[PDB]
Design a protein around this nucleic acid. Structure first.
Length: 813
RNA sequence: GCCCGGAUGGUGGAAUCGGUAGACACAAGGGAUUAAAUCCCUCGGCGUUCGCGCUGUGCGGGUUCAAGUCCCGCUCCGGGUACC
């Protein structure tokens, strides 16, 4: 064994080993309990960022640990490889998106290997390869034939393919109650984004208008307070009136471009269905065209938005709901928003909210001018992009003008990778020959738009279970073996997009017979952002210039706080504190630099120690150095121990009191570390516990046979406890220690519960809650015996609650 | 304005159970060694007769025998949102 720990001589050899032995490749073994550990797959931008390293280290820790518990562990990796940045990069450079992407994949793949993440590399996927996207093309055609896909023009004013995610809204909402092991914050974000709403459509007659006008309200109980209607700028009733009306004309145009209320009177009168009175119809900026019918009824008395509109434009404010105490409401300043009993409403006077809502809804429904309507804030999923670098949409327009999917025997529709980008138009649109095809004996033009990249990331988790299956999108027996994902790790920024889509997609696959389960992932862990110090100076021109923390010459006060800072050019810098890493703040830290500086193990250890997985981590070079010194101390202790050669078998009966208590701490540490990693997922305190035992072990004597056999037990346990964090050093150390086999197949240490019996316990004696004594009594002892002993204590003598083997308190009388 | 988080030493963070506040580490000071590195110790605040005594978890309160933890106010900090 070398005296000095040198990661450059260890890590790349251990990584080769893992490749040659295929250590982390797994099959569908029914003789083992499966564990599927998944980290959000990276986009191949070119280099790993510190957020990748954190995400993937957390994942690797769990995967390695669960393997040592005896599970069959799937930890897959791959590339979300389509998307916008490759188009830009291709143009800036001399190239095309495909080769730029594959070059990045190779470079980033090597980085991941150099960090030593135990992936099953046999299951590696690149989502821009036909072998992957072909299946989402087939799936889309099936969705279309099942009526879940449609085309329409929308404004984000382009025609688009939509998938009917709203057909699954109720279930996506309801099934959140099954997600006990997802964080409340993500669940609440999904609830709010779905935005399920119960209400009533109310249809009106408009006097000089050809059509009826329909509005959506969540508050039909306020309908006798309706003094006008309001329509979106893009509503067709507004477009018609705008022909004669230049005031309205310019208002509509203004609303397309560039929380104040703004409106113009349309001139149209609508007939209130209950009263029969004419009310006016205004165009208003606060009514979204895309939600509900794009038209509301206005009740200024009780909708704050309608209050400010009516107050601005002089329209009537009419009170129809009473205040909580039953008194008529104060409308002189704002709307009365709370639900309450009706007045000023004829039939419906005296009805409380629920009764008013139903009575009015029922009356309108019976008159044929209302119906209950459930809307969602959730929009249908627009999946088409006017971009080249994405999977082609498998749809076609025959010369008929008729539209159908690309036939099965023409799938996949392959994106040609050999292209020159003019930077302006997609190559597959620019070449007019590419679109031309023949379908069903007929000439046709195939879709030129491509899928948004969310399409690929919505199902990769499942394809990892059968990456090479050629028969279908999924092999159901393999998918159901592995799914649902046990833990999914990745940032909270994905909560309302990817984290929703993949649930939807899971449910689509379920409903196609493809998978067995309702939800894709049991636990979601959102790891916190990595932060770094940020500095800037102000130039002579008044512009801020951000300076990398590496380049800051800082001056600290007596207590180590930064009190002044300069760069080498002499610029006075202002320290802005720990912040999110960015190219704009110029404070990003390159993990490759840190891996080459300290070794992958040091970087992994620091990232798992500095902070709880779900909280922000502050990058501190002094912290990384601390981690580096710790591993050197661990290396050092194994080097001195093994230098003394083989050890006798440990004899637990003949151990000394000192030896027994040291052993007890080894085993108590095994228990705590097991619980922190396995149940609490508090990795930072797990490492802390290992550090604390190491400090004790560095002081233990190692000359007697029994001392050396104990140390052997301890070090073999420590090397295993650390292995999920720092597997390169632990792989090597295990061998040095003559452990059986490769550490990766070694069993996780189990605490020997005979070694943990305490004999005595400490008890804190308090008088009026404040500690006066600390005393040692057996776990064996009865309540009297503990107070008897307490009473014999002389500082207790100068001055009744009991917790066994813990505390005794005396309220003074 | 809005929704959802959060506040413990010089710093990151511990305290899982309401029951010894500050584990572990960083920084700093003293020691061994010749600057650096590494290994030996001290380190919440105040007082101190150097043995300890008192105080302390943003500020108020409530429950309790006991609150960093549970409950309610207030202040301040962070993230998310755009008339659904």
């Amino acid at each position: 064994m070398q005296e000095q720990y040198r990661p450059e001589e260890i890590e790349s050899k251990v990584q080769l080993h893992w490749d040659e032995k295929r250590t982390f490749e797994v099959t569908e073994d029914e003789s083992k309990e499966k564990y599927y550990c998944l980290s959000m797959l990276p986009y191949p931008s070119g280099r790993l960022h510190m957020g990748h390293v954190r995400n993937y280290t957390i994942g690797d820790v769990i995967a390695r640990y669960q393997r040592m518990l005896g599970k069959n562990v799937l930890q897959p990796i791959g590339w979300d490889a389509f998307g916008l940045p490759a188009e830009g990069a291709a143009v800036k450079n001399n190239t095309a998106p495909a080769p730029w992407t594959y070059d990045n994949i190779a470079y980033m793949k090597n980085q991941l290997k150099m960090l030593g993440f135990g992936y099953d590399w046999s299951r590696e996927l690149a989502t821009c390869t036909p072998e992957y996207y072909r299946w989402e093309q087939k799936f889309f055609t099936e969705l279309y034939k099942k009526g879940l896909v449609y085309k329409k023009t929308s404004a984000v004013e382009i025609p688009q393919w939509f998938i009917k995610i709203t057909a699954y809204a109720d279930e996506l909402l309801n099934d959140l109650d099954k997600l006990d092991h997802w964080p409340d914050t993500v669940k609440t974000m999904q609830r709010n984004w779905i935005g399920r709403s119960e209400g009533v459509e109310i249809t009106f007659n408009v006097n000089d208008y050809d059509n009826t006008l329909t509005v959506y309200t969540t508050r039909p109980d306020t309908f006798m307070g309706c003094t006008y209607l309001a329509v979106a700028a893009g509503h067709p009733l507004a477009q018609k009136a705008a022909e004669n009306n230049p005031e309205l004309a310019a208002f509509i145009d203004e609303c397309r471009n560039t929380m104040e209320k703004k409106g113009v009177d349309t001139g149209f009168k609508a007939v209130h269905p209950l009263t029969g009175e004419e009310i006016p119809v205004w165009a208003a900026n606060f009514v979204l065209m895309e939600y509900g019918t794009g038209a509301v009824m206005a009740v200024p008395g009780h909708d704050q938005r309608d209050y400010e509109f009516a107050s601005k434009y002089g329209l009537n404010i009419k009170p129809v709901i009473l205040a909580a105490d039953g008194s008529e409401p104060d409308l002189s300043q704002q709307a009365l928003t709370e639900k309450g009993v009706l007045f000023n409403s004829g039939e419906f006077n005296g009805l409380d909210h629920e009764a008013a809502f139903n009575a009015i809804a029922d009356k309108l429904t019976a008159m044929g001018v209302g119906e209950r309507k459930v809307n969602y804030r959730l929009r249908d999923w627009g999946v088409s992009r006017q971009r080249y670098w994405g999977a082609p949409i498998p749809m076609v327009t025959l010369e008929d003008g008729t539209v159908m999917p690309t036939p099965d025997d023409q799938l996949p529709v392959i994106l040609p990778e050999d292209v020159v980008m003019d930077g302006i138009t997609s190559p597959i649109k620019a070449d007019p020959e590419w679109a031309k095809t023949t379908v069903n004996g007929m000439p046709a033009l195939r879709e030129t738009d491509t899928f948004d990249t969310f399409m690929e990331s919505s199902w990769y988790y499942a394809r990892y279970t059968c990456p090479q299956y050629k028969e279908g999108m999924l092999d159901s027996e393999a998918a159901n073996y592995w799914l649902p994902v046990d833990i999914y790790i990745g940032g909270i920024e994905h909560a309302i997009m990817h984290l929703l889509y993949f649930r939807f997609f899971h449910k689509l696959m379920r409903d196609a017979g493809m998978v067995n389960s309702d939800e894709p992932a049991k636990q979601l862990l959102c790891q916190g952002m990595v932060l770094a110090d940020a500095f800037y100076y102000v130039g002579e021109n008044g512009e801020r210039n951000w300076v990398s923390p590496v380049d800051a010459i800082v001056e600290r006060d007596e207590k180590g706080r930064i009190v002044k800072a300069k760069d080498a050019a002499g610029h006075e810098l202002v320290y802005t504190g720990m912040s999110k890493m960015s190219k704009s703040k110029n404070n990003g830290i390159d993990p490759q630099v840190m891996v080459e500086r300290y070794g992958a193990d040091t970087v992994r250890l620091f990232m798992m120690f500095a902070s709880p997985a779900d909280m922000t981590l502050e990058w501190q070079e002094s912290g990384v150095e601390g981690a580096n010194r710790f591993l050197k101390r661990v290396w050092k202790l194994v080097y001195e121990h093994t230098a003394k050669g083989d050890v006798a078998a440990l004899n637990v009966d003949a151990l000394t009191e000192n030896q027994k208590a040291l052993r007890r701490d080894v085993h108590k540490t095994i228990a705590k570390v097991t619980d922190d990693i396995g149940r609490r997922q508090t990795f930072n305190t797990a490492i802390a516990a290992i550090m604390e035992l190491m400090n004790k072990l560095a002081k233990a004597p190692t000359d007697g046979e029994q001392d050396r056999a104990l140390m052997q037990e301890a070090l073999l346990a420590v090397v295993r406890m650390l292995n999920p964090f720092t597997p390169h050093i632990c792989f090597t150390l295990w061998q040095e220690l003559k452990g059986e086999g490769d550490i990766d197949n070694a069993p996780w240490p189990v605490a020997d519960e005979k070694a943990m019996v305490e004999d005595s316990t400490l008890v804190v004696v308090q008088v009026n809650g404040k500690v006066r004594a600390k005393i040692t009594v057996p776990v064996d002892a009865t309540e009297e015996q503990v107070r008897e002993r307490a009473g014999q204590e002389h500082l207790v003598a100068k001055y009744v609650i009991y917790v066994p083997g813990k505390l005794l308190n005396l309220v003074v009388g």
